[PDB]
C-alpha cells in the first residue's frame, strides 16, 4: 500500500473510521447499493470516489455498499451524556 503524504493538508469531509448516521431510511437501495434504516451506524470504509457517494459498513448487517454523501450525518443526538 502507498498513500500520498507530502506535508500537511486541510480537512472537511469525513475520514475512514468515522461513524456516520443515516438521515433517512432505505429499505430498497439502487441496483448495486446497500440498504439501511434511519439512524444507522456505519463506518467509513473508504473515501468518496463516485461523486457524492461514500462507502461505509453496516454494523448490524455487516455488508459494504455505497451511501449518498447527502444522506449521512454526524452521529450526535440529544440523548446519552
From Swiss-Prot:
Expressed in various myeloid cell lines, detected in brain and lung. Residues 15-75 form the SH3 domain. It is found in: Cytoplasm; Membrane. Belongs to the protein kinase superfamily. Tyr protein kinase family. CSK subfamily. Interacts with KIT. Could play a significant role in the signal transduction of hematopoietic cells. May regulate tyrosine kinase activity of SRC-family members in brain by specifically phosphorylating their C-terminal regulatory tyrosine residue which acts as a negative regulatory site. It may play an inhibitory role in the control of T-cell proliferation. This is Megakaryocyte-associated tyrosine-protein kinase. The chain holds residues 41 to 108 of 507 of the full protein.
Amino acid at each position: 500500500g502507498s498513500s500520498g503524504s507530502s506535508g500537511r493538508m486541510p480537512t472537511r469531509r469525513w475520514a475512514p473510521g468515522t461513524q456516520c448516521i443515516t438521515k433517512c431510511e432505505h429499505t430498497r437501495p439502487k441496483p448495486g447499493e446497500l440498504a439501511f434504516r434511519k439512524g444507522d451506524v456505519v463506518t467509513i470504509l473508504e473515501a468518496c470516489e463516485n461523486k457524492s457517494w461514500y462507502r461505509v459498513k453496516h454494523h448490524t448487517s455487516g455488508q459494504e455498499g455505497l451511501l449518498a454523501a447527502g444522506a449521512l450525518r454526524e452521529r450526535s443526538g440529544p440523548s446519552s451524556g
